[PDB]
Coordinates of C-alpha atoms in Angstrom, one line a residue:
Chain Z
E8 CA 195.9 115.8 126.0
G9 CA 195.1 117.3 129.6
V10 CA 195.9 114.3 133.2
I11 CA 193.4 112.8 134.8
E12 CA 191.4 113.4 137.9
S13 CA 189.2 111.1 139.6
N14 CA 187.9 110.8 143.2
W15 CA 187.8 106.8 142.8
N16 CA 191.7 105.8 143.6
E17 CA 190.5 102.1 142.4
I18 CA 192.0 101.3 139.2
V19 CA 191.9 97.8 137.8
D20 CA 194.1 97.3 134.8
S21 CA 192.6 93.8 133.8
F22 CA 189.2 92.2 132.3
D23 CA 190.1 89.5 134.0
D24 CA 189.7 91.4 137.1
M25 CA 186.6 93.1 137.0
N26 CA 184.6 90.4 137.6
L27 CA 182.5 89.9 134.6
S28 CA 180.9 86.9 133.5
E29 CA 182.7 84.0 131.0
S30 CA 180.1 85.2 128.0
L31 CA 180.9 88.6 128.3
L32 CA 184.4 87.9 128.7
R33 CA 184.0 86.4 125.4
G34 CA 182.4 88.8 123.9
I35 CA 185.2 91.4 125.1
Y36 CA 187.8 89.1 123.8
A37 CA 186.0 88.8 120.6
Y38 CA 185.7 92.0 119.6
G39 CA 188.9 92.3 119.9
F40 CA 189.6 94.3 122.9
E41 CA 193.3 93.5 125.4
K42 CA 193.4 96.1 127.8
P43 CA 191.4 98.5 129.2
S44 CA 191.7 102.2 128.4
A45 CA 192.9 105.1 131.5
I46 CA 189.0 105.7 131.9
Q47 CA 187.8 101.8 131.5
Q48 CA 190.5 101.2 134.3
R49 CA 188.2 103.3 136.7
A50 CA 184.9 103.5 135.5
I51 CA 183.7 100.1 134.3
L52 CA 183.9 98.7 138.0
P53 CA 181.8 101.8 140.1
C54 CA 179.1 101.1 137.4
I55 CA 178.8 97.4 137.8
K56 CA 178.7 98.0 141.8
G57 CA 175.8 100.2 140.8
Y58 CA 177.1 103.8 141.4
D59 CA 176.2 107.3 139.8
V60 CA 179.3 107.9 137.4
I61 CA 180.8 111.0 135.4
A62 CA 183.2 110.7 133.2
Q63 CA 184.8 113.0 131.1
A64 CA 185.9 111.2 127.6
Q65 CA 186.5 112.0 124.0
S66 CA 184.7 110.6 121.5
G67 CA 185.5 106.6 120.0
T68 CA 184.9 102.8 120.3
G69 CA 187.0 102.4 123.6
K70 CA 184.6 104.9 125.0
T71 CA 181.4 103.6 123.9
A72 CA 182.6 100.5 125.4
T73 CA 183.1 101.6 129.1
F74 CA 179.2 101.8 129.5
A75 CA 178.1 99.1 127.0
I76 CA 180.0 96.6 129.0
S77 CA 179.0 98.1 132.6
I78 CA 175.5 97.8 131.3
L79 CA 175.7 94.3 130.0
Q80 CA 177.1 93.2 133.5
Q81 CA 174.7 94.2 135.1
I82 CA 171.2 92.7 132.2
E83 CA 168.8 89.9 134.7
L84 CA 169.0 88.4 130.6
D85 CA 165.3 85.7 132.1
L86 CA 163.7 89.1 132.4
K87 CA 162.3 90.1 129.1
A88 CA 162.0 93.7 129.7
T89 CA 163.9 97.0 128.8
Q90 CA 166.5 97.5 131.8
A91 CA 168.6 100.5 130.1
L92 CA 168.3 103.3 128.2
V93 CA 171.3 105.1 126.6
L94 CA 170.8 108.6 125.0
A95 CA 173.2 109.7 122.7
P96 CA 172.4 113.0 120.3
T97 CA 172.2 111.8 116.2
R98 CA 170.8 108.7 114.9
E99 CA 174.5 108.1 114.0
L100 CA 176.0 107.7 117.2
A101 CA 173.0 105.9 118.6
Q102 CA 172.9 103.2 115.5
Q103 CA 177.0 102.3 116.0
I104 CA 176.3 101.9 119.8
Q105 CA 173.6 99.1 119.2
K106 CA 176.6 97.6 117.0
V107 CA 178.7 97.6 119.5
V108 CA 176.8 96.6 122.1
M109 CA 175.1 93.4 120.8
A110 CA 178.8 92.6 119.5
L111 CA 179.9 92.6 122.8
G112 CA 176.7 90.9 123.9
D113 CA 176.5 88.6 121.3
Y114 CA 177.9 85.4 123.4
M115 CA 175.6 86.6 126.0
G116 CA 171.8 86.5 124.3
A117 CA 171.9 90.3 124.7
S118 CA 169.1 92.2 123.2
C119 CA 169.3 95.9 122.1
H120 CA 167.3 97.9 120.1
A121 CA 168.0 101.7 118.3
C122 CA 165.1 104.7 118.6
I123 CA 166.1 105.6 114.8
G124 CA 162.5 106.3 113.6
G125 CA 163.8 107.0 110.0
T126 CA 162.0 105.4 108.0
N127 CA 160.0 102.8 110.2
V128 CA 158.3 105.0 112.6
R129 CA 155.7 102.7 112.1
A130 CA 157.3 99.2 111.3
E131 CA 159.5 99.7 114.3
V132 CA 156.9 99.8 116.7
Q133 CA 156.1 96.5 115.3
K134 CA 158.8 95.0 116.8
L135 CA 158.8 97.2 120.6
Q136 CA 154.9 95.5 120.4
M137 CA 156.7 91.9 120.0
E138 CA 159.2 92.2 122.5
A139 CA 161.0 94.4 125.0
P140 CA 164.7 95.2 124.8
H141 CA 167.2 94.7 127.2
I142 CA 168.8 97.5 126.1
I143 CA 167.4 100.3 123.9
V144 CA 169.3 103.4 122.5
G145 CA 168.0 106.1 120.7
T146 CA 167.7 110.4 120.6
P147 CA 166.3 112.2 123.3
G148 CA 163.4 113.3 121.3
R149 CA 162.5 110.0 119.8
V150 CA 162.8 108.3 122.7
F151 CA 159.8 110.4 124.9
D152 CA 158.2 109.9 121.7
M153 CA 158.0 106.2 122.5
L154 CA 157.8 106.4 126.4
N155 CA 154.7 109.0 126.2
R156 CA 153.4 106.9 123.7
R157 CA 153.5 103.4 125.5
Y158 CA 156.2 101.5 123.2
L159 CA 158.7 101.8 125.9
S160 CA 158.1 101.0 129.3
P161 CA 160.1 102.6 132.2
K162 CA 158.9 99.7 134.9
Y163 CA 162.6 98.0 134.8
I164 CA 164.9 101.0 134.0
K165 CA 167.1 100.8 136.4
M166 CA 170.5 101.7 134.4
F167 CA 170.8 105.6 133.0
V168 CA 173.3 106.8 130.5
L169 CA 173.2 110.4 128.6
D170 CA 176.4 110.0 126.0
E171 CA 177.7 113.3 124.6
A172 CA 175.3 115.3 127.4
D173 CA 177.5 118.4 126.7
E174 CA 176.2 118.0 122.9
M175 CA 172.5 116.6 123.5
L176 CA 172.6 120.1 125.6
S177 CA 173.6 121.9 123.2
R178 CA 171.1 120.4 120.6
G179 CA 168.3 121.0 122.7
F180 CA 167.1 118.4 124.6
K181 CA 167.8 119.3 127.8
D182 CA 163.8 119.2 127.9
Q183 CA 164.0 116.3 126.6
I184 CA 166.0 114.7 128.7
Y185 CA 164.4 116.2 132.0
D186 CA 161.0 115.1 130.7
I187 CA 162.4 111.2 130.4
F188 CA 164.2 111.5 133.9
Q189 CA 161.2 112.3 135.4
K190 CA 159.2 109.3 134.0
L191 CA 162.1 106.5 135.7
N192 CA 162.1 104.7 138.9
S193 CA 163.6 107.0 142.1
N194 CA 166.6 104.8 142.7
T195 CA 168.6 104.8 138.8
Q196 CA 171.4 104.6 137.9
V197 CA 172.9 107.8 135.9
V198 CA 175.8 107.2 133.9
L199 CA 176.7 110.5 132.1
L200 CA 179.8 110.5 129.5
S201 CA 180.8 114.8 128.3
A202 CA 183.8 116.0 126.5
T203 CA 183.2 119.2 128.0
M204 CA 181.9 120.1 131.5
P205 CA 180.0 123.5 131.1
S206 CA 177.8 124.5 133.4
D207 CA 174.6 123.1 132.5
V208 CA 176.1 119.5 132.2
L209 CA 176.8 120.1 136.0
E210 CA 173.9 121.1 137.0
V211 CA 172.2 118.0 135.1
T212 CA 174.3 115.7 136.9
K213 CA 173.7 117.7 140.2
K214 CA 169.8 117.0 139.7
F215 CA 170.3 113.3 138.2
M216 CA 173.2 111.9 140.4
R217 CA 174.0 111.6 144.1
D218 CA 177.5 111.4 145.6
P219 CA 178.6 110.5 141.7
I220 CA 182.0 109.9 141.2
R221 CA 184.1 111.8 139.0
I222 CA 186.7 111.5 136.5
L223 CA 187.6 114.4 134.9
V224 CA 190.2 115.4 132.8
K225 CA 191.4 119.2 133.1
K226 CA 192.9 120.7 130.5
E227 CA 192.5 124.8 128.6
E228 CA 188.9 124.7 127.5
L229 CA 190.4 127.7 125.4
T230 CA 193.0 127.2 122.6
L231 CA 194.8 129.3 119.7
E232 CA 194.6 126.8 117.2
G233 CA 194.0 128.9 114.3
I234 CA 194.6 132.3 115.6
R235 CA 196.9 133.8 113.4
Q236 CA 199.4 136.0 116.4
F237 CA 201.8 138.1 114.9
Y238 CA 203.5 140.8 116.9
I239 CA 205.7 144.5 115.8
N240 CA 208.8 145.7 117.9
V241 CA 208.0 149.0 118.6
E242 CA 211.4 149.8 120.3
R243 CA 209.8 152.2 123.3
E244 CA 206.1 152.4 124.8
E245 CA 206.2 156.8 123.5
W246 CA 206.2 155.0 119.8
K247 CA 202.9 152.5 120.6
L248 CA 200.1 155.0 119.6
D249 CA 202.2 156.0 116.2
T250 CA 202.3 152.2 114.8
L251 CA 198.5 151.2 116.1
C252 CA 197.3 154.3 113.5
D253 CA 199.9 153.4 111.1
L254 CA 198.2 149.9 111.6
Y255 CA 194.8 151.7 110.2
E256 CA 196.2 152.7 107.6
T257 CA 197.9 149.7 106.0
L258 CA 194.9 147.0 107.3
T259 CA 191.2 146.7 106.7
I260 CA 189.6 147.1 109.9
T261 CA 185.8 146.6 110.5
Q262 CA 186.3 146.4 114.2
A263 CA 189.2 145.7 117.1
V264 CA 189.7 144.9 120.5
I265 CA 192.7 146.9 122.1
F266 CA 193.7 145.5 125.7
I267 CA 196.0 147.3 128.4
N268 CA 197.6 146.5 130.9
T269 CA 196.1 149.7 134.0
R270 CA 193.1 151.6 133.7
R271 CA 195.1 155.5 134.1
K272 CA 196.2 154.2 130.1
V273 CA 192.8 153.0 129.2
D274 CA 191.9 156.8 129.7
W275 CA 194.8 158.2 128.4
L276 CA 194.5 156.4 125.0
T277 CA 190.9 156.3 125.1
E278 CA 191.0 160.5 124.1
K279 CA 193.9 160.2 122.6
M280 CA 192.1 158.5 120.2
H281 CA 189.1 160.6 120.0
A282 CA 191.5 163.5 119.6
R283 CA 192.5 161.3 116.1
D284 CA 189.4 161.2 115.2
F285 CA 188.1 157.5 116.1
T286 CA 184.8 155.5 117.8
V287 CA 186.0 154.3 120.4
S288 CA 184.5 152.7 122.9
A289 CA 186.7 152.2 126.6
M290 CA 185.8 149.9 129.3
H291 CA 187.8 149.5 132.8
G292 CA 187.3 147.0 136.0
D293 CA 186.1 150.0 138.3
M294 CA 183.1 150.2 136.1
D295 CA 179.6 148.5 137.4
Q296 CA 177.8 145.9 135.5
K297 CA 174.8 147.9 134.0
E298 CA 177.8 150.5 132.5
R299 CA 179.4 148.2 130.8
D300 CA 176.3 146.9 129.5
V301 CA 176.2 149.9 128.2
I302 CA 179.3 150.7 126.7
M303 CA 179.2 147.2 125.1
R304 CA 176.3 147.3 123.4
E305 CA 177.4 150.5 121.1
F306 CA 180.1 148.1 119.8
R307 CA 178.2 145.6 119.3
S308 CA 175.9 147.9 117.2
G309 CA 179.0 150.0 115.6
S310 CA 178.8 153.0 116.9
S311 CA 182.1 151.9 118.0
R312 CA 184.4 150.3 115.7
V313 CA 187.2 149.8 118.3
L314 CA 186.9 148.8 122.0
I315 CA 189.9 149.5 124.6
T316 CA 189.6 147.7 127.6
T317 CA 191.5 145.5 130.2
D318 CA 192.1 142.1 131.5
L319 CA 189.1 140.7 132.9
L320 CA 189.7 137.0 133.8
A321 CA 186.6 136.8 136.1
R322 CA 184.2 138.5 133.2
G323 CA 184.8 137.0 129.6
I324 CA 184.4 139.9 127.2
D325 CA 181.0 139.7 125.1
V326 CA 182.6 140.2 121.2
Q327 CA 181.7 137.7 118.6
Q328 CA 183.9 139.2 115.4
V329 CA 186.3 141.5 115.4
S330 CA 188.7 142.0 112.5
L331 CA 191.5 141.3 114.9
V332 CA 192.7 142.1 118.3
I333 CA 195.8 144.1 119.5
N334 CA 198.0 143.3 122.6
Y335 CA 198.8 146.9 123.1
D336 CA 200.2 146.2 126.5
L337 CA 201.5 142.7 126.7
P338 CA 199.5 140.1 129.1
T339 CA 201.7 139.4 132.3
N340 CA 201.3 135.5 131.8
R341 CA 199.9 132.8 129.5
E342 CA 196.9 132.6 131.3
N343 CA 196.0 135.8 130.9
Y344 CA 197.6 135.9 127.0
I345 CA 194.9 132.9 126.5
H346 CA 192.0 134.7 127.9
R347 CA 192.8 137.5 125.9
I348 CA 192.9 136.0 122.2
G349 CA 192.3 132.4 122.8
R350 CA 188.7 131.0 121.4
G351 CA 186.6 128.0 122.7
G352 CA 184.1 125.7 120.3
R353 CA 185.7 123.2 117.8
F354 CA 184.3 125.2 115.3
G355 CA 185.3 128.7 113.2
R356 CA 188.5 128.4 114.8
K357 CA 189.9 131.7 113.3
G358 CA 191.5 135.4 114.4
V359 CA 194.5 137.9 114.6
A360 CA 196.1 139.3 117.3
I361 CA 199.0 141.4 116.9
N362 CA 201.2 141.8 120.2
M363 CA 202.9 145.3 120.8
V364 CA 206.3 144.3 121.8
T365 CA 209.3 147.0 123.6
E366 CA 212.3 146.7 124.3
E367 CA 212.1 146.7 127.7
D368 CA 209.7 143.5 127.2
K369 CA 211.7 141.6 126.0
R370 CA 214.4 141.8 128.7
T371 CA 211.5 140.7 131.1
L372 CA 211.1 137.7 128.7
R373 CA 214.0 137.1 126.3
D374 CA 211.5 135.0 123.8
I375 CA 207.6 135.9 123.3
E376 CA 207.2 132.2 122.0
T377 CA 208.6 130.5 124.9
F378 CA 207.2 133.0 127.6
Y379 CA 203.5 132.3 126.0
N380 CA 204.5 128.8 124.3
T381 CA 202.7 129.1 121.2
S382 CA 203.5 130.2 117.8
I383 CA 204.0 134.3 117.3
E384 CA 205.3 135.5 113.5
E385 CA 206.9 138.4 113.4
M386 CA 204.2 140.7 111.6
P387 CA 204.8 140.7 107.5
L388 CA 204.7 143.8 105.2
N389 CA 201.8 141.8 103.2
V390 CA 198.0 141.6 104.8
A391 CA 196.3 139.6 106.5
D392 CA 192.9 141.4 107.1
Chain L
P2 CA 149.1 148.2 132.5
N3 CA 150.0 145.1 131.0
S4 CA 152.2 142.5 131.7
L5 CA 155.0 143.1 130.4
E6 CA 154.9 139.2 128.4
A7 CA 151.9 140.9 127.0
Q8 CA 154.0 144.4 126.1
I9 CA 156.5 142.7 124.0
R10 CA 154.2 140.9 122.2
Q11 CA 152.2 144.1 121.2
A12 CA 155.4 145.2 119.6
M13 CA 156.2 142.3 117.7
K14 CA 152.4 142.3 115.8
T15 CA 152.0 145.9 115.3
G16 CA 155.9 146.9 114.3
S17 CA 156.6 149.1 117.1
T18 CA 159.9 149.9 118.6
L19 CA 161.0 148.0 122.3
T20 CA 164.4 146.8 123.2
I21 CA 165.0 143.6 124.8
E22 CA 168.2 143.8 127.2
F23 CA 169.5 140.5 127.7
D24 CA 171.9 139.2 130.8
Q25 CA 175.3 137.6 129.7
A26 CA 174.9 134.7 132.1
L27 CA 171.3 133.1 129.9
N28 CA 173.9 132.5 127.6
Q29 CA 175.1 129.7 130.4
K30 CA 171.5 127.9 129.9
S31 CA 171.1 125.2 127.1
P32 CA 168.2 125.9 124.7
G33 CA 164.6 124.8 125.9
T34 CA 161.9 126.2 127.7
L35 CA 163.4 128.5 130.3
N36 CA 161.8 131.0 133.3
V37 CA 163.3 134.3 133.3
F38 CA 162.2 137.4 134.9
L39 CA 161.1 140.6 132.5
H40 CA 162.3 143.9 134.1
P41 CA 161.6 147.2 132.3
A42 CA 164.6 148.8 131.3
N43 CA 165.2 152.2 129.3
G44 CA 162.5 152.0 126.7
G45 CA 162.3 148.5 126.6
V46 CA 162.7 145.1 128.7
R47 CA 165.4 143.0 130.0
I48 CA 165.6 139.7 131.1
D49 CA 167.9 137.8 133.9
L50 CA 167.1 135.8 136.3
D51 CA 167.2 138.1 139.0
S52 CA 163.7 138.6 141.2
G53 CA 164.3 141.8 142.5
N54 CA 164.0 145.1 140.5
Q55 CA 160.0 145.0 140.1
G56 CA 160.5 141.6 137.9
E57 CA 157.8 139.6 136.4
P58 CA 158.0 135.8 136.1
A59 CA 157.9 134.2 132.7
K60 CA 158.6 131.1 131.0
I61 CA 159.9 131.4 127.1
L62 CA 161.4 129.6 124.7
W63 CA 165.3 130.4 124.9
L64 CA 168.2 129.9 122.1
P65 CA 171.2 131.0 124.2
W66 CA 174.8 131.9 121.7
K67 CA 178.2 129.2 121.9
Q68 CA 181.6 130.8 120.8
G69 CA 182.3 128.0 118.1
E70 CA 179.5 126.1 117.9
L71 CA 175.8 126.0 116.7
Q72 CA 173.0 125.9 119.4
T73 CA 169.7 124.4 118.6
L74 CA 166.0 124.6 119.9
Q75 CA 164.3 121.2 119.3
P76 CA 160.5 121.6 117.2
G77 CA 159.1 119.6 120.2
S78 CA 160.0 122.7 122.5
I79 CA 157.7 124.5 120.6
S80 CA 154.0 124.4 121.8
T81 CA 152.5 126.7 124.2
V82 CA 150.2 129.2 122.2
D83 CA 151.8 132.9 122.1
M84 CA 154.8 131.7 124.4
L85 CA 158.1 133.9 123.9
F86 CA 160.8 132.9 121.6
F87 CA 164.3 134.7 122.1
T88 CA 167.9 134.1 121.4
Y89 CA 170.6 135.9 122.6
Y90 CA 172.6 139.6 120.6
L91 CA 173.3 138.8 117.0
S92 CA 176.5 140.9 116.2
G93 CA 177.6 138.6 113.2
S94 CA 176.0 135.5 114.5
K95 CA 173.8 133.7 112.3
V96 CA 170.3 132.3 112.6
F97 CA 168.4 129.7 110.4
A98 CA 165.0 128.6 110.7
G99 CA 162.8 125.4 110.0
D100 CA 159.1 125.7 109.7
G101 CA 158.2 123.1 112.0
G102 CA 161.7 122.5 112.3
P103 CA 164.9 123.0 115.0
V104 CA 166.1 127.3 115.5
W105 CA 169.6 127.2 115.0
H106 CA 172.5 130.1 116.4
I107 CA 175.3 129.6 114.4
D108 CA 178.4 131.3 115.9
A109 CA 180.0 134.2 113.7
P110 CA 183.1 132.8 112.2
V111 CA 181.7 129.0 111.4
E112 CA 182.3 128.4 107.8
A113 CA 178.7 127.7 106.3
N114 CA 179.9 124.3 105.0
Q115 CA 181.1 123.2 108.4
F116 CA 177.8 124.0 109.9
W117 CA 175.5 123.0 107.2
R118 CA 177.5 119.7 107.9
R119 CA 176.7 119.7 111.7
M120 CA 172.7 121.1 110.8
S121 CA 172.6 117.8 108.5
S122 CA 172.9 115.3 111.0
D123 CA 169.8 116.4 112.8
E124 CA 166.4 114.3 112.5
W125 CA 164.6 116.9 111.1
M126 CA 166.7 117.7 108.2
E127 CA 167.8 113.8 107.6
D128 CA 163.9 114.2 107.2
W129 CA 164.6 116.9 103.9
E130 CA 164.7 114.9 101.2
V131 CA 167.8 116.1 98.1
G132 CA 165.4 117.2 95.1
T133 CA 162.2 118.8 97.5
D134 CA 161.9 121.6 99.6
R135 CA 161.1 123.1 102.6
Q136 CA 160.0 126.6 104.3
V137 CA 163.3 128.4 105.7
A138 CA 163.4 131.6 107.6
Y139 CA 168.0 132.1 107.5
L140 CA 169.3 135.7 109.1
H141 CA 173.1 137.1 108.6
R142 CA 175.1 140.6 109.2
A143 CA 174.8 142.0 105.6
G144 CA 178.5 142.7 103.8
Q145 CA 180.0 139.4 105.9
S146 CA 182.3 137.2 103.9
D147 CA 180.2 134.8 102.3
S148 CA 181.6 131.5 103.0
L149 CA 180.5 132.3 106.4
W150 CA 176.8 132.5 105.7
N151 CA 176.2 131.9 101.8
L152 CA 174.0 128.0 101.6
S153 CA 173.5 128.7 97.7
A154 CA 175.5 125.8 97.2
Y155 CA 173.0 123.1 99.3
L156 CA 169.5 125.5 98.9
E157 CA 167.6 127.0 95.6
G158 CA 165.6 129.6 97.0
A159 CA 165.1 133.4 97.8
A160 CA 167.9 134.9 98.7
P161 CA 168.5 135.0 102.7
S162 CA 167.2 137.8 104.9
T163 CA 169.9 140.2 106.2
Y164 CA 170.5 142.9 109.5
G165 CA 173.6 145.7 110.0
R166 CA 175.4 146.8 107.0
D167 CA 179.6 146.2 106.1
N168 CA 179.4 143.5 108.6
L169 CA 178.7 146.5 111.2
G170 CA 175.4 146.1 113.2
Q171 CA 173.3 143.8 115.8
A172 CA 170.1 142.3 115.5
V173 CA 167.7 140.3 118.1
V174 CA 165.5 137.6 117.1
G175 CA 161.8 136.8 118.9
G176 CA 159.5 135.2 118.1
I177 CA 155.4 133.9 119.2
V178 CA 154.0 130.3 118.9
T179 CA 151.4 130.2 116.9
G180 CA 150.9 125.9 117.5
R181 CA 152.6 122.9 117.9
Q182 CA 155.8 123.5 115.5
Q183 CA 155.1 127.0 114.7
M184 CA 155.9 130.4 115.6
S185 CA 156.1 134.0 114.1
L186 CA 159.5 135.2 113.9
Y187 CA 160.4 138.9 114.2
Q188 CA 163.8 140.5 114.6
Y189 CA 165.2 144.5 115.2
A190 CA 168.4 145.6 113.7
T191 CA 170.3 148.2 116.7
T192 CA 173.3 150.1 114.7
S193 CA 174.7 154.2 115.3
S194 CA 171.4 155.2 113.8
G195 CA 170.0 153.6 116.6
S196 CA 167.5 151.0 117.4
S197 CA 164.9 150.0 114.5
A198 CA 161.2 148.5 115.0
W199 CA 160.4 145.0 115.5
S200 CA 159.6 143.2 112.0
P201 CA 158.7 140.2 110.5
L202 CA 161.1 137.9 109.8
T203 CA 159.9 135.7 106.9
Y204 CA 160.3 132.2 105.6
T205 CA 160.8 131.3 102.3
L206 CA 160.6 128.8 100.3
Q207 CA 164.0 126.6 100.2
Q208 CA 164.9 123.5 97.5
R209 CA 167.9 121.0 98.7
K210 CA 170.5 120.5 96.0
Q211 CA 172.9 118.0 98.2

């Protein structure tokens, strides 16, 4: 679990010190909450006060309760109009939010509807024409539809929540989100919750928010989960090349990536593997951007079954799939190790990496597992792709 | 002569050769409509966000690639006619398209069971009933562990389309919008041989088992 990092030092560790209406407290305690989570102690207050907030939070009942409590506290109950709009990336999530919102707002007399559609895109419209719910939660496509078709009104919307933004932008709702925002009033409060914080999510906060409150959980975005890591005792450096060629005889290898610490060795190894009859593409730091574009297309096409390169750190390798990856030269630290063999994203958590260990290497780092802080078995005499 | 935007459509339609070059930076941009700048490259077109270098402004449908995940282009983004559609290079990646549905780009190592699972939370899929069917374009690199692409368990219909050979090769997938929720997808392969010509990426009829 990373570490919490706000720009808002105020912290409230009780629901009673938050100035919530009595009826809302009843709903909160009746739902089973007793003491707020790390994210609530920091986010609920700046929301009720009306400031734009960014919260890096994993999915759960506690995260949903952050914006649910905030929204309910601002609703003007006698105003029979939609005043809050929550976007979620699926029908399922949207409906769970409605459940949570209704439960808490149960004792308040707060209405909340879920733009789902499903088997009712004609039926539910008959309910929206009858009453404007206080809170609307739906998916971006479906909500944007209801706004264009005038069954929802942006007129009294003062609170706009993007839940699981990273997801929603992966599922192609960026356009629909941008379009919905263009229909809301200028002074509209934006709350954005997302577990990851990639470039296009940051870009959203920059366009929709002003001097927002950030609550982040900085943690390594690359991991070794799923990567099977191995090492070979090579004794001395000179015997690395002979070990590499023997791996090709032992293992089945479609394509591979080989990391090297210096350029002078990338060029040395590139020609030696040419001489040993290998389709090889070489890449280093001294090259331009347009040069590397070329040697990467060769590799992505199959013209090279092997890419030998150097740690880039700033630039990630444009590699999608490979039988394995070889640390012919051990990286100097945990960060560089994780750049070379760590993968991003939640799925396809699978890989193979092999590290070559000289005796000099052992001296400078006592234990490989400890030094890089990960499991690394000695390579067996079996077969693992 | 013709804006590059048009020369590309020409290649796709007739079935000529015209390689595409993408700047890795496009992958920072979420799926959707994106303003990009085309440049004449070496016997093809380069797509980046740089206006210099004899650049021609264009507005495309864009679908990036993202390590360990699926990226989806939504059907409601598909309307402006003769608009070009592009996805990042395919080098292990699968691409699945629904007729008037979304278009998914799947990272190479994502087990079919796991991406199918993710796809099915999408409204268009939840609108696709057990026992009934839809049109589906589906490309996957040739000779890749079945568990990474084979959807026989979920779909009953013509076999998928493929690119490369022996889990080696790159493919590019483009498209042209032909109405609301409709576009004609094309493709081309790059291999040690060289770069092949454009060609249709058909949508066969698939029935849903579960």
